[PDB]
Amino acid sequence: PQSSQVTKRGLTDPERAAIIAAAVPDHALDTQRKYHYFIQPRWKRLSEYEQLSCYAQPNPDWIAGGLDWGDWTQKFHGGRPSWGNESTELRTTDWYRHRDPARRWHHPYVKDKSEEARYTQRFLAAYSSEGSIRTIDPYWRDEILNKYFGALLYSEYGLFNAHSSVGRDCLSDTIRQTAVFAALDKVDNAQMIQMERLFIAKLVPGFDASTDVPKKIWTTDPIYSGARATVQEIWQGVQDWNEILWAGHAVYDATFGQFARREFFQRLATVYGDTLTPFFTAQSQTYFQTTRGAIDDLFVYCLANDSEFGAHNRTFLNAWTEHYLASSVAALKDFVGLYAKVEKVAGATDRAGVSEALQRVFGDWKIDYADKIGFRVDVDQKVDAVLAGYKN
Amino acid sequence: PQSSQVTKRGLTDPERAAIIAAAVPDHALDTQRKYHYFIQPRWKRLSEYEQLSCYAQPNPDWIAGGLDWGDWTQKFHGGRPSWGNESTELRTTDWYRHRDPARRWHHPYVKDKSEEARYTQRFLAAYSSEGSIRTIDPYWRDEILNKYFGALLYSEYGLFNAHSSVGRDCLSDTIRQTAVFAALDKVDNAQMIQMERLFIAKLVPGFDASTDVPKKIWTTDPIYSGARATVQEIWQGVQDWNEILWAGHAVYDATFGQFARREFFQRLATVYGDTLTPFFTAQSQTYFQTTRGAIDDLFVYCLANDSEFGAHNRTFLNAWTEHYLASSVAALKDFVGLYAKVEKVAGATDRAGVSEALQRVFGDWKIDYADKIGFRVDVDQKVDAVLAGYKN
Amino acid sequence: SSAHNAYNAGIMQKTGKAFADEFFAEENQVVHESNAVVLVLMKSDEIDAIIEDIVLKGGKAKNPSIVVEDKAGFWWIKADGAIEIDAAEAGELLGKPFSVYDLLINVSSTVGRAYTLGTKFTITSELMGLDR
Amino acid sequence: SSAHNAYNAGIMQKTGKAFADEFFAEENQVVHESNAVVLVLMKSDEIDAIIEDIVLKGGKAKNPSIVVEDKAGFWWIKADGAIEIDAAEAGELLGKPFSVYDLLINVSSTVGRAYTLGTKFTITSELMGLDRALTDI
Amino acid sequence: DALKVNRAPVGVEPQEVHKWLQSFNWDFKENRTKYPTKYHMANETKEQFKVIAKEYARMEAAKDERQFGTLLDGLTRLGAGNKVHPRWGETMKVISNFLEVGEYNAIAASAMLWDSATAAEQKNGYLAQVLDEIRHTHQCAFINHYYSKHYHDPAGHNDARRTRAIGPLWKGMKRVFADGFISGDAVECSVNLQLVGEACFTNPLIVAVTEWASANGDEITPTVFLSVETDELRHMANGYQTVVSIANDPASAKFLNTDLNNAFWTQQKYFTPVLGYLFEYGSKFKVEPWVKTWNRWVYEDWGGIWIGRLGKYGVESPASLRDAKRDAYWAHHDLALAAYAMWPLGFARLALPDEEDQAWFEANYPGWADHYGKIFNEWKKLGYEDPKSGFIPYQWLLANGHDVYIDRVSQVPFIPSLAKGTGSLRVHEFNGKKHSLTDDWGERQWLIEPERYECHNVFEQYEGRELSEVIAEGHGVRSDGKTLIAQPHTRGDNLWTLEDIKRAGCVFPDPLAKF
Amino acid sequence: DALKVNRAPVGVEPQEVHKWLQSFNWDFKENRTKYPTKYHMANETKEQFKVIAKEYARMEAAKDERQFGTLLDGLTRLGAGNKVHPRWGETMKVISNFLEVGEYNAIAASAMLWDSATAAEQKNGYLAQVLDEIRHTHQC
Amino acid sequence: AKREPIHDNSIRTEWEAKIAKLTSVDQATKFIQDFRLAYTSPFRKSYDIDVDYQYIERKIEEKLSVLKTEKLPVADLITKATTGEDAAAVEATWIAKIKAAKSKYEAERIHIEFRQLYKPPVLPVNVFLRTDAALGTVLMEIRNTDYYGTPLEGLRKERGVKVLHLQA
Ligand SMILES: [Cl-]
Ligand SMILES: [Fe+3]
Ligand SMILES: [Fe+3]
Ligand SMILES: [Fe+3]
């Protein structure tokens, strides 16, 4: 006999359901049942992704694309608007135009990552039961993988936190979603690197999965000096939210990051008998390509080709690229010193192998980004600039 | 309107809901709400797996463990019972005792495989976008992987079909579930091998993913002669459903299968620069360990240690092991001829490397299966028998 | 088109003795060939949209013999010859990924020869492998 | 022993002018410290089993000030001091995997300091980081 | 080369793998079925619903997540588990657990089809079906599991896998959709399991029933059963492919019409009376007359769309159809007499038809009132519902010459002196043992195949034993150890105990002693 | 070595990763918030609900599947969407869409808390919160 | 008259005590063969233990099977019946026997008796199951030839029943 009424449900209680049935009209009062039917579809028909995402941000007409009017109700001390044009150098006729080609709203994003979460733990339980760690090259495992792959988690962690101000400052809903999902994928990468090290620790007596050595390498080893300098600038040195996303994903992570994750740790795992690391890089590289699709749409489809401000935006994108490409080339020049520490494998770790890896990264980058904004780049010159750091 | 009554729902229609409420008692008529509360729990508490599975099979008291009584309602021409003791040589005080340690009823089983299904397609879409196939050894890709990994799909396919009569003949519910889930995992392995080959074909001009060459190799290449002979016997040469499961998973697949999938294609992929195949072998090896947990429970916990028939059952299990271990050793001796076709890699494809691989497989098998049923095995003798097939 | 495809067509209209007299008539002690198909769709957000915007519009325009009846938990559909549903048309309506495989999540029963081909699900009176 | 933790305790029993007179009384124009915690659980198969077989049995036995009220879509729980739920006890009851993370799928709200520790979820009146421990052990 | 590659995003869709499955088989001398069969024709057929293992799992998991969301979240929050009319909640103890055994046997039958298939594509298709029948076993279990947790009477929802063994209606369930599938010709499963079982009887049993559930307040059963049947379109299609192969080879086709008739009779013999009884007597609110449900689904639609169409290719209308239609009209009313009279042997609580039920029965089955109605009303007057009455109708039947017999073949009970459905008693002695058969089709089966049909019946096992002893031995009690699971009313008061049963002094006879 | 290894089945649980998150930060001069604040105190705190990205997704996806099953399957089959008293169906036009903008602004506010946090554990926690506020926008 | 309880009764207890006294493979084989001829199939000699014989048969099977594993060389478990015969010879002999059967009534008794005499553990399981299936194929085919050709009156005569009652 609780103190408060046991409320009767209108759906199942006879008298309340009868009252409701009498109140509800015998016909619909409009035929337009498409939620936010007025959104301009990017594709042949409106997607649920667009319906649930688009125009959630309440921008007024003085922020390009907004449907509302008037000033904000409360602004920062001094007058900074809640959201404002001062947040970025780039301009557009409509900040809402961006569309993630994977069409991720929150549900499909966590559904997919949940799959990866549960399968990873099943995979690990079977891999430990298999004993497959027994054939890994021990020098690779202990001196290269544990230490320098461990150190790379700090690059992913910094790129994650570069999104904090982006999440506050950016000017539309689909952009905010892209940015936040990109950020989680970066902190996931860092956490997965540590998960692999913690897992190997359970299999290999004496293998130390503490971050002390990785952190020492990230913060003081010349191999990561250029990388750390760039991440520090992208994360904490600027606040233009378009500059952060472009420098972070389209320049630094697309060159240095792809070389480190794909050309070094993933590729060489499959030269030194490492049957574990490819399971983890499979995830970071899937995340990179998903993020790239959305970053490509924001900066190429929307901003570099905005009918009014495309050339204007390319002027800034070109200047940013010149700067952060120089930062990334310096980072790669530092990083290829790591080859001095690995066992030589013809076609992979010799000068020819490293050159072909740099040609893939700079060549792919020229196609995927530089050509799309009009940034001239001599691929051979960048390869040679990095190879000046290769010992031999 | 419609020709038939629009039935009113008792849950929401006021008049029918009021009539129902008047009929339903104001108190519960029993307090035992645990579905099939009388099942003997294997673990500290009865599981939902057990509740939904156990005693679904309607066995009578003359099939050990059955709670029903009397003859079947309809038997085969001649008199074969619907289920019967004539189906297997092994005996037990209760055929219901088996428990899958993964506690898979149908839902958790398809939930998990669904995760792998969708993540696989995301991985492939990103792997193709990454271009990572560019660094695979072409001879491995074209002459070893495409041809002999493809041919391995026929071993998995045959082991899949070995379960057809098991699914009909076996004597309890948890056993039937274990067997059918093992069968799907085996046909999945075969389908995944073909999936990888079809995928490479989209990336590599001239790469032929037809099964013609794989099938020719499986059916006529000496390298697979012994394996195919064993699979043919386990699948179609016997009908004792315990013999099929033991010979198939606990002897053949645990020695030849593990060597081929793990020690050859998975391990050497990570020596020849193959960043694709480990994603696929990760799945077959996860499935192998899950299947092993259930096979181990049926034959070790239940049958080899049944209070009345343990020693009796080990007499048959030992005789089967003698026979099918000989078949599997012969299969491995044929198979190691494949190493004559691969590029030499010290510690992996030389005599010492192959010797250590066979020591892992036979050594693990002695621990995981042979020691548990009392089967004496000299590991070095089996390694030496297989190495007689290795071309120095 | 289309009264003969109603759930309560023909003898099903009769009650009491009249029903019994036809049910037990000599001519109704053997089956009678029918050119119809029956499709059952489990009620759900996706199915209800397909019913209203596909089956009862383009479907019925192409096959005016189609009858749809409300059976509480499911839709009962009967038609001459065949019924078809293109999952690509459903996907466009629903605004979310929707392959033929996803369409079948709430296709609950078939009386007829059913199959998928491409993005299209079909149930037909045709006897494939026997008919020409 | 638990009437003070009822949803309609105290002023909430009054109506009309009697309610207004206490609501606007001078002494009720500032908050009053309360030692209680409130926990809201979303109704579901798992939660409903936890309510009946944990919260209302062992929970109330350990903390007899607990009050549970039916609020249609959720359970409203109020108690002195603290409420705890051990996901390991819930898993034993449900017969399926159930970590503390799974417990939180239907833990809908908290008025108090809440946290997980091992397999146990707790909401307490304690002000962790401010209140000082009572013993050194 | 090492620098240039197409980086367009691609995967591999299920149909791209599926087109290579046929090539996974290889030839060797022993590659043939292990099971006996009359059917040896070419059967290289094509799957109509292309699936591979990964896509199978994706589809079924998606079905599951929606089903279990509705059950464990939405309907539990609504308290729907106890919004069911007691008559219908009792009915689901029997429908769900009895179907469960049909589903379980369907696993085994589907494995025989898997074993006897000669095409890799068909072996692939039948493994998917094998998996589905496991899914359905667990879905049926989950319904009773959910009822055990949320319905006002968990007893019998919570233990049918042992308490079903007490009673005679369970015996026939072990044949209908069970032994009749798995104990016989493996290729013939395409006819009995699939062409008849799946294509004909699952529709009324699993689909039509959901509307009766909803009418009586049960939204659990529709949520699950409607998902169960989504898998059946694959199964029907598998079966039809093999039926075509049979019809195309004259040596195989000469067996088809006799197998079809035997399947149809075997299944309808039990399905028709038992499900009609459960629909009409196990409900308060009725959707339509059972005989109309049966006319729609079995006679007109299955009969016309499958069998009538196949008449173009030599398939004959089952010769037993006339006998079956008589059963569809009256046999469930006959069965109700036995079910109510022997209520203590079940695991469900029964309700005599009330005044509006009786008017409905007479309006839709004229003659019901003067036969069945008068009997039920007299039993009520004698104390049918009252635990202090000492009255159980089975004894009353015997005292008036209305003996109950069990068909040696189908296990369906038969009361020749009261039945209006199809049947007539034949009693034979063979090798010192007496046997009771009840119709022309089953009598032939037994005469030709006596060693297939040696099923002990409840009178043979229980001969000379008192009812309450049999019930107690079989665990036919609630958790107090004394109140029966079964009841002759659906109220919450005056529940019958073992002592209440014992007072009646009901002892099992040998019904064939008089012959 | 190459032959001997412990083959006991093990994984890595979320709390095992979580305990290393605090060490993911590193010191540099510009490592400080971009936003104006009056609050400059030490704020090295520990999260009360240990979560990592993979477990965050697992948890929220589990909530979602049950929610969307109820909506798209059960309640639609019941016709519940038109069983609402008109006054209340009208009220939900404004409650849900007005709440939507609150959730949307909560994304941005949570990002400011993420930016102004000084502990790696708190930055991790505020990203999870940022993600939740997106979830809530889409739920409304 | 009055049956004892289903699963625990004096008939089963008495037979268990008989079974426990078996000490050799030869003795247990003659015991189980004699038992199956006397008490199983429609051609059994006696129904005196009808509701208990299936359980008792299980118990005899168990005793014989353990005696085999304790006493016999492994090869005999694979290749011989416990009669001493070669298992493959038993298979060939009985398949030929049924293929020579001139009527369904001859074929049915051959199949039934094969099972009475050689059901495992007498014959190895693998040999037994494939022989039983080959026999069943022949029996099914001959029985499903003109299945409806003989009126019931004639089938009753062919079967040899004593007709005790025909309603109507
Ligand atoms: Cl630490
Ligand atoms: Fe089924
Ligand atoms: Fe089926
Ligand atoms: Fe929120």
**H or E segment to which residue D119 belongs:** none
User: Which phi and psi (to 5°) does residue A141 adopt?
Assistant: -55, -50
Partner-chain contact B77 G140, CB within 8 Å: yes
Q: Compute the distance between CA of residue A319 and CA of residue B277 in angstroms, rounded to an integer.
A: 42
Q: Compute the distance between CA of residue B168 and CA of residue E112 in angstroms, rounded to an integer.
A: 6
How many Cβ atoms are within 10 Å of E63's Cβ, its own excluded? 23
Nearby residues of D130 by Cβ (< 8 Å), 6 or more positions away: none
At residue F131, what is the residue type? L
Domain count of the fold of chain E:
1
Measuring CA to CA, which residue among F135, F35, F114, F102 is closest to residue A167? F114
At residue G19, what is the residue type? I
Q: Mutate which of A24, A59, A107 to disrupt the F interface (most F C-beta within 10 Å)?
A: A107
Query: Widest CA span of chain A, in angstroms?
Result: 88
Which residues from chain E sit within 8 angstroms of residue A363, using beta carbons?
A: 3
Q: Compute the distance between CA of residue E199 and CA of residue C109 in angstroms, rounded to an integer.
A: 9
Q: Does C52 touch chain F (CB under 8 A)?
A: no
Token duo for residue A24 = 């509800």
Is residue E355 a known part of a binding site?
Answer: no
CB contact at 8 A, E86 and E147: no
Partner-chain contact G42 E34, CB within 8 Å: no
Partner-chain contact C95 A45, CB within 8 Å: yes
**Cα→Cα distances E144→B110, D71, E106, E150, E211, Å:** 22, 28, 19, 10, 18
3-state secondary structure E397-425: HHHCCCCCEECCCCCCEECCCCCCCCCCC
Partner-chain contact D72 A3, CB within 8 Å: no
A201 Cα to chain C: minimum distance (Å): 42
At residue D94, what is the residue type? L
Measuring CA to CA, which residue among E163, E90, A16 is closest to residue B18? A16
CB contact at 8 A, F72 and C44: yes
Measuring CA to CA, which residue among E151, E150, E156 is closest to residue E86? E151
Partner-chain contact B2 C9, CB within 8 Å: no
Is residue E136 a known part of a binding site?
Answer: yes
Vertex E244, ends E240 and E248: CA angle to 5°? 170
Q: Does A211 touch chain E (CB under 8 A)?
A: no
**Cα→Cα distances F19→A146, A191, A195, A199, A210, Å:** 18, 11, 11, 14, 10
Measuring CA to CA, which residue among E137, E248, E242 is closest to residue E192? E242
3-state secondary structure of F124: helix
Q: Which ligand is nearest to the CA of F22?
A: 1
Q: Mutate which of F68, F72, F82, F138 to disrupt the C interface (most C C-beta within 10 Å)?
A: F72
Nearest C-alpha in F relative to E72: F66
- What is residue D132's DSSP assignment? P
**H or E segment to which residue A155 belongs:** helix A150-161
Q: Does D44 touch chain F (CB under 8 A)?
A: yes
Known catalytic residue at F140 = yes
Distance E235 CA to ligand 3 centre (A): 5
Among residues F111, F112, F119, F140, which one is catalytic?
F140
- What is residue C40's DSSP assignment? E
Q: Nearest 10 degrees: CA dihedral of B180, B181, B184, B188?
A: -160
Burial of F30 (C-beta count, 10 Å sphere; 0-12/13-18/19+): exposed
Terminal C-alpha separation, chain E: 91
Q: Compute the distance between CA of residue B302 and CA of residue B242 in angstroms, rounded to an integer.
A: 12
Nearest C-alpha in F relative to A110: F57
DSSP F82-96: G-S-HHHHHHHHHHH
Q: Compute the distance between CA of residue B327 and CA of residue A126 in angstroms, rounded to an integer.
A: 27
Strand partners, D41: D75, D107
Q: Does A6 touch chain E (CB under 8 A)?
A: no
Question: Which residue is listed with tokens 């099964």?
Answer: B211
How many Cβ atoms are within 10 Å of F82's Cβ, its own excluded? 11
Is residue F40 a known part of a binding site?
Answer: no
Q: Compute the distance between CA of residue A351 and CA of residue A340 in angstroms, rounded to an integer.
A: 11
Q: Compute the distance between CA of residue B27 and CA of residue B12 in angstroms, rounded to an integer.
A: 22
Q: Could you tell me the strand order of the sheet in which C107-111 lies?
A: C67-70, C74-80, C36-42, C107-111
Which residues from chain A sit within 8 angstroms of residue E78, using beta carbons?
A: 9, 11-12
Token duo for residue E196 = 């008849």
Which residues from chain E sit within 8 angstroms of residue B218, using beta carbons?
A: 26
CB contact at 8 A, E240 and E169: no
Nearby residues of B247 by Cβ (< 8 Å), 6 or more positions away: B233, B234, B238, B320, B323, B324
Q: Compute the distance between CA of residue F65 and CA of residue A279 in angstroms, rounded to an integer.
A: 27
Q: Compute the distance between CA of residue B115 and CA of residue A115 in angstroms, rounded to an integer.
A: 5
Which residues from chain D sit within 8 angstroms of residue E76, using beta carbons?
A: 43-45, 48
Nearby residues of E374 by Cβ (< 8 Å), 6 or more positions away: none
Q: Does C48 touch chain A (CB under 8 A)?
A: no
Residue boundaries of the structural domains of chain G: 4-71, 72-144
User: Which phi and psi (to 5°) does residue C109 adopt?
Assistant: -160, 160
Q: Which ligand is nearest to the CA of F17?
A: 1
How many Cβ atoms are within 10 Å of B165's Cβ, its own excluded? 26
For E82-157, strand residue ranges (E) read none
Secondary-structure breakdown of chain F: helix, strand, coil percentages, each rounded to the nearest 5: 65, 0, 35
Token duo for residue A6 = 């046991």
E390 Cα to chain C: minimum distance (Å): 38
Q: Where are the alpha helices (DSSP H) in chain B?
A: 14-23, 48-53, 106-130, 138-139, 150-162, 164-169, 173-203, 212-220, 225-236, 241-245, 258, 267-269, 277-296, 310-335, 351-365, 371-373, 379-387
Q: Mutate which of E68, E226, E315, E361 to disrupt the C interface (most C C-beta within 10 Å)?
A: E226
At residue F33, what is the residue type? T
User: Which phi and psi (to 5°) does residue D108 adopt?
Assistant: -95, -30
Q: Ramachandran region of residue D66, left (φ > 0), alpha (ψ -120 to 50) or beta?
A: beta
Find the helix packing angle between B310-335 and B225-236, rounded to 10°. Answer: 150
Q: Does F57 touch chain D (CB under 8 A)?
A: no
Rg of chain B on CA atoms, in Å: 25
A88 Cα to chain B: minimum distance (Å): 31
Q: Does B356 touch chain F (CB under 8 A)?
A: yes
At residue F128, what is the residue type? A
3-state secondary structure of C117: strand
User: Which phi and psi (to 5°) does residue F107 adopt?
Assistant: -55, -50
Domain count of the fold of chain A:
1
Q: Does D46 touch chain E (CB under 8 A)?
A: yes
Find the helix packing angle between G125-143 and G104-118, rounded to 10°. Answer: 160
Among residues E140, E189, E200, E506, which one is catalytic?
E140
Which residues from chain B sit within 8 angstroms of residue D87, using beta carbons?
A: none
Partner-chain contact C7 B2, CB within 8 Å: yes
How many Cβ atoms are within 10 Å of E469's Cβ, its own excluded? 15
Domain holding B279, by residue range, is 1-392
Nearby residues of E9 by Cβ (< 8 Å), 6 or more positions away: A289, B125, B126, B128, B129
Q: Compute the distance between CA of residue A249 and CA of residue D24 in angstroms, rounded to an integer.
A: 59
Give residue ranges of E with CB < 8 Å to any G CB: 34-38, 184-185, 255, 258-259, 319, 416, 424-434, 440, 443-444, 447-451, 454, 456, 460-465, 473, 512, 515
Partner-chain contact B75 E179, CB within 8 Å: yes
Q: Mutate which of E233, E268, E320 to disrupt the C interface (most C C-beta within 10 Å)?
A: E233
Token duo for residue E29 = 């001398």
For chain G, strand residue ranges (E) read 162-166
At residue E432, what is the residue type? G
Which residues from chain C sit within 8 angstroms of residue F72, using beta carbons?
A: 44-46
Q: Do chains D and G touch (3 or more CB pairs under 8 A)?
A: no
CA B147 to chain centre: 24
Domain holding E168, by residue range, is 1-515
Q: Does D48 touch chain B (CB under 8 A)?
A: no
Token duo for residue F27 = 């010191």
Rg of chain F on CA atoms, in Å: 22
Q: Residue C60 half-sphere exposure, CB side, CA atoms within 13 Å?
A: 15
Nearby residues of D81 by Cβ (< 8 Å), 6 or more positions away: D35, D36, D37, D63, D65, D124, D125
At residue B190, what is the residue type? A
Distance E37 CA to ligand 4 centre (A): 65
Q: Compute the distance between CA of residue E88 and CA of residue E85 in angstroms, rounded to an integer.
A: 5
CA A270 to chain centre: 25
Q: Compute the distance between CA of residue A136 and CA of residue B278 in angstroms, rounded to an integer.
A: 14
Is residue F121 a known part of a binding site?
Answer: no
Q: Compute the distance between CA of residue D96 and CA of residue B35 in angstroms, rounded to an integer.
A: 14
Burial annotation E479-507 (CB, 10 A radius, 16+ → b, else e): eeeebbbbbbbbebeebbbbebbbbbebe
Vertex A191, ends A190 and A194: CA angle to 5°? 95
Measuring CA to CA, which residue among E245, E20, E17, E14 is closest to residue E118? E245
Q: Compute the distance between CA of residue B362 and CA of residue E191 in angstroms, rounded to an integer.
A: 48
Q: Compute the distance between CA of residue G83 and CA of residue G103 in angstroms, rounded to an integer.
A: 29
Measuring CA to CA, which residue among B256, B277, B255 is closest to residue B266? B277
Q: Does B4 touch chain C (CB under 8 A)?
A: yes
Q: Compute the distance between CA of residue E462 and CA of residue G164 in angstroms, rounded to an integer.
A: 23
Distance E163 CA to ligand 3 centre (A): 26
- What is residue B59's DSSP assignment? -
Q: Compute the distance between CA of residue E407 and CA of residue B20 in angstroms, rounded to an integer.
A: 38
3-state secondary structure of A30: coil
Vertex B388, ends B383 and B392: CA angle to 5°? 110
Nearby residues of D7 by Cβ (< 8 Å), 6 or more positions away: A2, A3, A4, D67, D69, D76, D78
Q: Compute the distance between CA of residue E123 and CA of residue B161 in angstroms, rounded to an integer.
A: 8
Find the helix packing angle between E256-281 and E321-341, rounded to 10°. Answer: 40
**Cα→Cα distances B48→B37, C15, E107, E158, Å:** 11, 47, 21, 13
Rg of chain E on CA atoms, in Å: 24
Partner-chain contact F57 A160, CB within 8 Å: no
Q: Compute the distance between CA of residue C53 and CA of residue C71 in angstroms, rounded to an integer.
A: 19
Q: Compute the distance between CA of residue F68 and CA of residue A38 in angstroms, rounded to an integer.
A: 25
Find the helix packing angle between A379-387 and A310-335, rounded to 10°. Answer: 30
**H or E segment to which residue E240 belongs:** helix E232-248
Q: Compute the distance between CA of residue A295 and CA of residue A185 in angstroms, rounded to an integer.
A: 14
Q: Compute the distance between CA of residue B335 and CA of residue B151 in angstroms, rounded to an integer.
A: 12
What is the number of helices (H) and of strands (E) in chain C? 5, 7
Q: How many residues in chain D?
A: 137
Partner-chain contact E85 B129, CB within 8 Å: no
Partner-chain contact A4 D69, CB within 8 Å: yes
Measuring CA to CA, which residue among B220, B157, B218 is closest to residue B183? B157
Q: Could you tell me the strand order of the sheet in which G162-166 lies?
A: E433-437, E426-430, G162-166
Q: Compute the distance between CA of residue B8 and CA of residue B17 in angstroms, rounded to an integer.
A: 10
Which residues from chain A sit within 8 angstroms of residue E3, using beta carbons?
A: 356, 359-360, 363
Vertex F122, ends F20 and A240: CA angle to 5°? 110
Q: Compute the distance between CA of residue B132 and CA of residue B129 in angstroms, rounded to an integer.
A: 8
Token duo for residue A199 = 């897992």
User: Which phi and psi (to 5°) does residue A240 adopt?
Assistant: -55, 110
Partner-chain contact B44 D92, CB within 8 Å: yes
Distance E232 CA to ligand 3 centre (A): 5
At residue F117, what is the residue type? A
CB contact at 8 A, E417 and E402: yes
3-state secondary structure of E286: coil
Q: How many residues in chain E?
A: 515
Token duo for residue B247 = 């010979």
Residue boundaries of the structural domains of chain C: 1-132
Q: How many residues in chain C?
A: 132
Resolution stated for this PDB structure, in Å: 1.9
Which residues from chain F sit within 8 angstroms of residue C48, using beta carbons?
A: 76
